[PDB]
Amino acid sequence: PGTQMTLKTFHFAGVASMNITLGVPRIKEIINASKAISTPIITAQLDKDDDADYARLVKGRIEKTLLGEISEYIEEVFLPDDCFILVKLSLERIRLLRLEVNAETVRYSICTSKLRVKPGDVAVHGEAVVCVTPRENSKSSMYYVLQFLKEDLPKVVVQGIPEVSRAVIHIDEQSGKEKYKLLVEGDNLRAVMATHGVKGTRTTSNNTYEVEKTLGIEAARTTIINEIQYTMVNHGMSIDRRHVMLLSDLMTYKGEVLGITRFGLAKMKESVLMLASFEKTADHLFDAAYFGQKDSVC
Amino acid sequence: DDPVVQEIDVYLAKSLAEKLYLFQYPVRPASMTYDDIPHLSAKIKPKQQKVELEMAIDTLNPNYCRSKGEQIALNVDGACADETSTYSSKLMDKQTFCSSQTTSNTSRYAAALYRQGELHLTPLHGILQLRPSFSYLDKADAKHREREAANEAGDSSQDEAEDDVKQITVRFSRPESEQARQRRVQSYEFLQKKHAEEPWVHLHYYGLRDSRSEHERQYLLCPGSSGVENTELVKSPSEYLMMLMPPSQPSNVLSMAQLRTLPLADQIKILMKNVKVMPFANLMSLLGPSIDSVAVLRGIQKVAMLVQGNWVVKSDILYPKDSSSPHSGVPAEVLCRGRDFVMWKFTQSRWVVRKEVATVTKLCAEDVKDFLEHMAVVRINKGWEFILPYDGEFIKKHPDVVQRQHMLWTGIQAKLEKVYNL
Amino acid sequence: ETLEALILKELSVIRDHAGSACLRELDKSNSPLTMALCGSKGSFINISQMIACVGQQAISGSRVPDGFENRSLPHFEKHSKLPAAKGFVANSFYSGLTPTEFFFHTMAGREGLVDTAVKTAETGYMQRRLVKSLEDLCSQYDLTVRSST
Amino acid sequence: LPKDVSVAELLRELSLTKEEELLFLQLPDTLPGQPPTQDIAENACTLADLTEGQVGKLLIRKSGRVQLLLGKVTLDVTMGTACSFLQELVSVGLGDSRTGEMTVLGHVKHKLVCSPDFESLLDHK
Amino acid sequence: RMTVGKLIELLAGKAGVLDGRFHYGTAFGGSKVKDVCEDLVRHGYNYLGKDYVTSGITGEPLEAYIYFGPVYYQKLKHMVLDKMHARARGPRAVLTRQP
Amino acid sequence: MLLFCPGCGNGLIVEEGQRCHRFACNTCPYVHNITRKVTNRKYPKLKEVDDVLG
Amino acid sequence: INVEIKKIMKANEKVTSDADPMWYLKYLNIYVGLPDVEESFNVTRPVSPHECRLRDMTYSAPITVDIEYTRGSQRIIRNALPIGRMPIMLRSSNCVLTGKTPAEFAKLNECPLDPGGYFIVKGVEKVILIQEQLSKNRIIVEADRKGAVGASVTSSTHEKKSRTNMAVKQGRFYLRHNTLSEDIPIVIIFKAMGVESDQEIVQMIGTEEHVMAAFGPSLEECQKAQIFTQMQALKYIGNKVRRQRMWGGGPKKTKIEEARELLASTILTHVPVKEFNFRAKCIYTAVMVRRVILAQGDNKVDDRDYYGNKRLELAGQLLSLLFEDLFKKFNSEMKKIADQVIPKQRAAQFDVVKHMRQDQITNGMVNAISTGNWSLKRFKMDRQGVTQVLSRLSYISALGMMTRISSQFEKTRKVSGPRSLQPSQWGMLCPSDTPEGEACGLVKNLALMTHITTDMEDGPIVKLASNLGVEDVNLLCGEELSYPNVFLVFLNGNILGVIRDHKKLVNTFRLMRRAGYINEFVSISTNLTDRCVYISSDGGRLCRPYIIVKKQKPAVTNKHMEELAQGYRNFEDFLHESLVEYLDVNEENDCNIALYEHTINKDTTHLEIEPFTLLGVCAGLIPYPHHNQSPRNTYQCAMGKQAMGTIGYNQRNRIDTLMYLLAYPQKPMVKTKTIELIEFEKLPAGQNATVAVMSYSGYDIEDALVLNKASLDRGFGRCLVYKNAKCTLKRYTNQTFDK
Amino acid sequence: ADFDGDEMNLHLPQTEEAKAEALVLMGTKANLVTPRNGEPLIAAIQDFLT
RNA sequence: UGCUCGC
Ligand SMILES: Nc1nc2c(ncn2[C@@H]2O[C@H](COP(=O)(O)OP(=O)(O)OP(=O)(O)O)[C@@H](O)[C@H]2O)c(=O)[nH]1
Ligand SMILES: Nc1ncnc2c1ncn2[C@@H]1O[C@H](COP(=O)(O)OP(=O)(O)OP(=O)(O)O)C[C@H]1O
Ligand SMILES: [Mg+2]
Ligand SMILES: [Zn+2]
């Protein structure tokens, strides 16, 4: 079917966006069992699938939001007595996006992996005003490190999972009821399941490594089976489930998802002749000669 | 769009042709000027123009840091040396502006002074860009190096008299290879030394507020009448275009312009070789109305023959004596005889049968076809017809040429009847 | 992207309606229609393309990209997003294709050719790896699949 | 600041005000003339070869045309690059071989560009 | 494959061999279908190339008309005689004793 | 914002003197005391309320 | 062979040795002459190309040269001394086949319809394919592996080619070059190249708020260090300079000097410095930084597949480089022989004539043409597959292979980025003609109506640009580069200057080119996105003739075509009378072309001559190609390259290793105008058969066909296969011979 | 295959056991369906469906 | 070793 697969396009799976690798590259990424894959997809089910307000609320909860994405203006004001950076939060956009973020949450977001900013440096004056007064760290840093803050102060995370890059509200228009789910283009399944309002019992993912690390080896096998079957059906060609089940069992029989690459094949197989014939002939042969490993003809 | 208003005159002045310089500060906006800044001196060189301005800056102003001034003054110079000091006092007081040469030749640039109804132009002897030079830091680094050397020598409180007598290290003046000599000549250090070889010239500064400025400002004007016809600047547009754009230095290879550049006889010959069938009026139109008709007629009478009022190029012109048939390889004389027979048949009758010509001339089909295609077209149920219609106007206009061509065709017919036994 | 989707939708509407009209106006015993009904070779889409109207030429699931500055070909205006200027082929194979439509069709054909050329080697390597990894398993007599060891 | 035009520039320089102004115009490499008794060749003819007096006229036609009639030919004058940095036109006169005078004549604000009307020169002959 | 150009070439060639002409298949032009159809109808043949044909085997006419016409076929260098290969025991390589 | 010294043209940094915060250059004794408030807004792009697709 | 070889000889006219001065070897004039054979004992003889094909020898002409030298300080001159043998391309100026009639071709046993243009070496016919490469001295803004949008410029002069890059890996711009140990900030290089004020640097980069916001980190990183003068920056650069493995000669504190030399000569070679004045180089790198900043926002990444940035090298440039390398090697060998012989031999004065080996250049040319691998150590160019065996399967095969073009990608992997059919190939390259297989998309064919430009003098271009009001870049600061109405004018990658109202400039330049004062192949284009006016005059650019359209009416009328048909005018007259002009890809990017007369609208600048010229030579055989599918046309071209038929009129005397002929070839009934143009009907490669489209006996299931026995019996499809069996009886070292 | 010039290989076993294994396991009648999904591959084709 | 091909 790899030769039968045409490597088509425009198969957005009904959302008209979120370009996902499907076809021979997808099968290759699945069989390689790489820890990091291209365009990871996480499907999350909602407790209240009929309400759009709850969907947008949990979306804002899971989606990473930077400070510059919500603040209306950040200005470095140099008063005659002291110089500091003033950030004005747009409460209108905050309540529009339904983010549970106030001045105190923003202040708590600062002082975290930002040149060790002391808590006394950040202060709150109004309801949506944050004042940051940095001090010289004496490690080749002076007051004119303010600019450095201007480079990364809007790029701090105030709410959401840092690994999550983009989450969208997918809707199913079934005649009985139109339900709401979350499509997350991130690489953190545990955080998505742990978030409030997300039915973690019915949350899946495309990255087999995350599923293996989070929900066990059997969940990883089931995810591999489902993903391979879905990728095969996307091209209109059908494969009996027994083949993909055998493949997943072979990939998940030592307790760890091992890929079809040379590393996984070496970790699974023991025969020296086959390891030498497949890839890395000289290295495997010299290592076997060093270990004195006797190879059977099984 | 007529010149309704503003017919301004343009005058020229040569008083300050060699004394006019243009100074532009790429880092100083036009809003702030150096009129209030007291200048001290200006170094300059006549050849290889590079002016260095030395000005003075205030200190009591709040925009000056006296502590940093003392620091930079102690850094650039010594403690109390003052023999060669970049600053007279213990503060940074003098500022140096260095000039860079934009272009070598400034003849195409001119300064324009505008007065009511007139614009005076003055050539520029040179254009330089003035930028704040950082030269005190180099002397500061040199002084820091010499202070480091002094500290190295001062490792001991009392230094014994070193027996560091300079052994005679006179190096061979090796004959340098021409490549290495060219590298040395093209080196930056050699160019900088050559520039430094020219002695400096000191000049005082006279600001715009000085009366000397307004005094010498009148030199950009010239004494002359309002309306004067310039003796020069009278070349035609064609001559100007030739000046500002000086020149670098099949048989249809030569173009129309290359044809017109050739003598009239060559033009007629090439045109008859290319077209091989054309009227006299078309030839007169192509050659041009400025050429007399008698000369064109005499030229065409030597390379063409008259057939039914039209002109057909001669056979020997198309086929030189050293040429041959590209299809059969027969000599060019047979081709000329066959073409003359074809032209005679066309003069006798407008319709020519291909089979009859092939039988009489004993030539192959392709040669007869090429002979006919040059002067005839295929008409169904009628054979081959002459491509151009009967032109009686040229015949009526020139009866003597008609009689000459008639007797020439009579001679050609006699020759053809002698050869082919007609 | 909304405008692109709407224009693609309109061109597809034209294509499918012309194809339906051609299929309805065609009489029986027609050899292309007969071979399309039995499924031996061809389909209704090929018949519509070769009789009624060729469809929108799609490169990587989208209209023809602007090879030149702000336009695909110099024969069209700049920033012009008209259907004929972006890949649409109004004429059919019977009536003949304009030079721009023929160029777009050749672009699509070459895209398909290079896609197949890459797919051949990629799937060859994938098949080699998969077989080298899976060749050890065998079904034993006790109904248990065991490896070589 | 809107981009001005040479016609309106001269109009406001003469009609709106009467104060003199220093301009910096760029003339072509070769002027439509011959070096007068300069020992030649069709070489470059710059302002250094021409004499004093009236050398040409400045015409301002309708629709914004600004031409310079320098004899039989007519060039066109357009606005150059709008410089905003300081440009001081000064006179450096070396009266003596040891001491010279630098005379600040004025400030340069606008730049003009004179170009041959190649279209007219081509359609002429 | 949608090779309508082959049918157009066949029709133009049939019209040309009927009227003694050489039709042109120039890209984005050439002789139109209407002209060759008129040339066919003028010579007494069908305006679509399909002609009444009797089966040579059974001697009975075919139920559908057959599309006849002159087509310019070109033979390729790929021959079965040059590509035919059969290998006996034969020779082997010195390094590895294989064919 | 980015400010430059009128003297030499190098970039100006913000430091604290003996009386008030001032702009200063690292290569010349030029300084400039701050009298009134100075601000430099950037107006970052506000993430729109993304539509629910499907 | 007429101009470039003389320039190469002039570049190395004098060669001398360091030892024993006042000795020299001076070349005066070099000639190639007519092709001859060295068979006769010390005597030459005219030889035809067919004789060279039969005798398995090379078709070359003796390269001779007249020289003057000093034997014993007395000047000795030679007027005719051969030095090598240049293989003569067929149908060239010096080839015997040119200026010949078909009868004279028959006398020489050569087909008159043979395209020629191929070399004959050792009896085999080799063709040098047209090489395709990226244009040199051009800024390319592209994304890196990690997604960083950087810039690259491959500055290539006649001596050195250096690709310098610029990255934004950490929000600041670093400049990377092969001569630097570590990439250094761009602001340090700015300070090293003369401009020390940061305000001037920022003005040169741009005055836009986002530009300053992006360039801020670079200024901050520069201010972190103590680099504020030119000397400090030059010292910092020299610290990052590594010696080329202990270069011979005493350094004597060359660190700052090495840094300045790398900045002046090695970095940005195409940008020239008059006398250590980096103003032009500063403006160039500032424009590059501005382009990177602008591209760092909207993803306006330039594409490599755009053929406007492609250059085509013919056999001429390759042979010129090869001859230059061989002549330099010969001169070095002669200088070494002189140094070894003159100072110690005897009072018998050494002369080069006794040591001028004539086999060097000849063997070099023969090997480079035959084997096809070119190794130029002076340019460090290691190419393969330059020459290929001319395919004599048919006339169409050779005619299509003669106009082939290979890609620089040199296919070994699945790139799938140049293999696509770009819209830039319009009118220049055939879209359908491509080899089906692994070489799909990287081996292409030229169109029916196309031309490749040569190099110009570039003098009058500069003169007209300077006279048209282009202000000198040294006269103004970089701030004017940030103005919306100021447009940069370039010239072959060099910043020619700035201009305002570029419409007038472009119109005047085009009108002057039409008038004839500027070469018709000089191209001018405008990029409004980058606001850059490009003036291209280098060779290798593809141009196509187009009819000029002025005010909705083409300049070409029926009267002009009637005069052309009658012979009053030729194509050169159309070129001179401003009727038809050549357009480049970059130039046609800005022009409006109409396919037909009815398509002409108000905004039309040119008219297409003929649409069917889009296809190539092989694609021209397809009858009604617009009614078929593109893979069908590609397969048809691929099979017609292998079509069996007659080769030429001399196919009987021709003896090749494999030849296929048709017994009774027939010209097609449906013939394209391209067939009449290429004279394919004189040499057909097929037969017309009465085909009936029907299903019969089920023996034609998938693509098969049923043949008639009586037809094959009467000569249909009858073919002839000619093979060659060659044997050699050579004399060995010992006085024994094969018998 | 598509009968457009495809070249195919033909091997002759030199052992009775190999011949029997080929006839039994790789028999055409015994491999009418693919092991991928059980669909029959050896079936009617063009000019047989029509 | 190179390259043009054949699917
Ligand atoms: N340049 C070149 N190299 C070749 C040629 N034939 C073989 N080689 C080289 O030799 C290697 C392959 O050797 P083989 O083709 O197996 O040699 P062979 O055919 O066994 O030689 P014989 O035993 O003489 O038939 C390749 O890696 C090539 O580099 C040739 O004709 N030209
Ligand atoms: N590189 C290759 N690897 C494997 N098989 C190949 C290769 N090249 C050709 N083939 C063989 O040829 C066949 C390819 O034909 P296919 O691509 O299906 O039709 P096609 O060549 O597109 O014909 P049309 O253009 O559709 O008329 C299938 C395969 O067995
Ligand atoms: Mg096949
Ligand atoms: Zn400063």
Q: Which DSSP string corresponds to D23-49?
A: EEEE--SS-SS--TTS--------TTT
Are G602 and B284 in contact by the 8 Å Cβ rule? The answer is no
Per the entry, the structure determination technique was cryo-EM
> Which nucleotides on strand I sit less than 7 A from a protein beta carbon?
2-7
Under DSSP, is residue A236 helix (H, G, I), strand (E, B) or coil?
A: coil
Who among A73, A78, A81 is closest to F41 (CB)?
A73
For the CA of H1, the nearest ligand:
3
Q: Which helix or strand (DSSP H or E) is residue C112 part of?
A: helix C99-134
Indicate the SS3 state at residue D89: strand
By DSSP bridging, strand F21-25 and strand F12-16 are antiparallel
CA angle G243, G245, G251 (to 5 degrees): 50
Alpha helices in G193-240 (DSSP H): 198-205, 209-224, 230-239
Burial class of residue G725, CB neighbours in 10 A (0-12, 13-18, 19+): exposed
H47 is in an annotated binding site: no
Name the minimum distance, in Å, from the CA of G217 to any CA of chain A: 8
Measure Cα distances from D99 to B43, B201, B212, G521 in Å: 11, 8, 16, 56
Separation of G437 CA and I5 C1' (Å)? 10
Residue C12 to residue C29: CA distance in whole angstroms: 28
**DSSP states along G406-446:** E-TT-SSS---SSSS--GGGTTTB-SS---SSTTTTTEEEB
Q: Smallest Cα–C1' distance to nucleotide I1: which residue has it? A: G371
If one counts every other C-beta atom within 10 angstroms of the C-beta of residue C68, the result is 22
Tokens of G539: 């060779």
**Which residues of chain G from 223 to 262 reach within 8 Å of chain F, CB to CB?**
223, 228
Give the pairing type, strands A198-205 and D21-26: unpaired
Ligand nearest to the CA of F9: 4
Structure token digits, residue B147? 């202070």
Residue C29, Cβ neighbours under 10 Å: how many? 9
CB within 8 Å: A75 and F42: yes
Q: CA-based Rg of chain C, rounded to a whole angstrom? A: 23
Closest CA to G445 of G480, G399, G481, G377: G399
| Cβ proximity of F47 and A70 under 8 Å | yes
Q: What is the CA radius of gyration of chain B?
A: 45
- CB of B135 closer than 8 Å to CB of B96: yes
Look at the block and give the residue holding tokens 């940005």: G268
Which residue has the CA at smallest separation from atom 1 of ligand 2? C120
Catalytic residues of G: 703
Q: Are G627 and E8 in contact (CB under 8 A)?
A: yes
Tell me if residue G231 falls in helix, strand or coil.
Answer: helix
Question: In the numeric block, which tokens belong to residue D65?
Answer: 């045309």
- Measured distance CA(G495)–CA(G508) in Å, rounded: 20
Beta strands B304-307 and E50-51 are unpaired
- Assess contact for D6 and G501: CB atoms under 8 A: no
Burial of G84 (0-12, 13-18, 19+ CB in 10 A): buried
Answer whether G310's CB lies under 8 Å from G140's CB. Answer: no
Of E48, G433, A244, G596, which is closest to residue C31 (Cα–Cα)?
E48
Q: In the 417-436 stretch of chain G, whose C-beta falls under 7 Å of nucleic acid strand I? A: 435-436
Please state, in angstroms and rounded to a whole number, the distance separating the CA atoms of residues B304 and B93: 95
**Considering only CA atoms, which of E40, E54, E37 is closest in space to residue G692?**
E54
Strand order from edge to edge, sheet including G687-693: E50-51, E66-73, G687-693
G140 vs G309: CA distance, rounded Å: 10
- Strands A129-132, A122-124: pairing is antiparallel
Length of chain G: 739
DSSP G712: H
Q: How many CB pairs below 8 A link C and E? A: 15
Contact G469, G513 (CB under 8 A): no
How would you list the strands of the sheet with A83-89, edge to edge? A71-78, A83-89, A129-132, A122-124
First CA to last CA across chain C, in angstroms? 56
Ordered alpha helix ranges (H), chain F: none
The reply to whether residue A239 touches residue H38, judged by beta carbons under 8 angstroms, is no
Kind of pairing between the strands at G606-607 and G593-594: parallel
* 3-state DSSP assignment of residue D60: strand
Cα G711 from Cα G689, distance rounded (Å):
9
Alpha helices in G24-89, H assignment, sequence order: 49-55
Residues of F comprising the binding site for Zn(2+)?
Answer: 5, 8, 25, 28
d(CA G572, CA G555): 15
Query: Which tokens is B95 given?
Result: 């500022």
Name the closest-CA residue to atom 29, ligand 2: H1
Q: Is any Cβ of chain H less than 8 angstroms from the Cβ of A241?
A: no
CA distance D62 to D74: 16
**Beta carbons of G367 and G121 less than 8 angstroms apart:** no
A182/A45 Cα distance (integer angstroms): 7
Task: Using alpha carbons, list the distances in angstroms from residue B217 to B14, B110, B212, G252, G467.
Answer: 13, 15, 8, 53, 30
Collect all residues with Cβ–Cβ distance below 8 Å to B180 and sequence separation of at least 6. Answer: none
Q: Is the CB of G382 under 7 A from strand I?
A: no
* Cβ(A138)–Cβ(A190) below 8 Å: no
Across D12-33, b (16+ Cβ under 10 Å) vs e yields ebbeeeeeebbbbbbbbbbbbb
Phi, psi values for residue B294, rounded to 5°: -65, -40
Query: In H, which residues are within 8 Å of C40 by CB distance?
Result: 45-50
H6 touches strand I (CB under 7 A): yes
Tell if G126 CB is < 7 Å from nucleic strand I. Answer: no
Using CB atoms, pick whichever of F2, F10, F27 lies closest to residue G212.
Answer: F2
Contact (Cβ atoms closer than 8 angstroms) between residue G267 and residue G162: yes
Beta carbons of A239 and H37 less than 8 angstroms apart:
yes
G440-473 b/e with 16+ CB inside 10 Å = b? bbbbbbbbbebebbbebebebbbbbbbbbbbbbb
Strand order in the sheet with F21-25: F12-16, F21-25, F31-33
Q: Name residues contacting ligand 2 (CB within 6 A).
A: C 120; E 1; G 631, 635
Angstrom resolution of this structure: 2.8
How far apart are the C-alpha atoms of A78 and A73, rounded to whole Å?
Answer: 16
3-state secondary structure of H18: helix
Residues 5-44 of H with CB under 8 A from A: 36-38
Which residues neighbour G210 within 8 Å (Cβ) at sequence distance 6 or greater? G293, G297
B22: helix, strand or coil: strand
Contacts (Cβ under 8 Å, ≥6 apart) of D44:
B107, D29, D30
Report in angstroms the alpha-carbon separations of A161 from A54, A98, A166, A202.
Answer: 18, 16, 10, 19
> Could you tell me if H32 and H40 are in contact, meaning their C-beta atoms sit under 8 angstroms apart?
yes
The token duo for B387 is 């491509």
- Tokens for C43? 């389909």
Please, what is the Cα angle at F19 between F16 and F25, to 5 degrees? 40
Asked if residue D118 lies in contact with residue D73, where contact means CB atoms within 8 angstroms, the answer is no
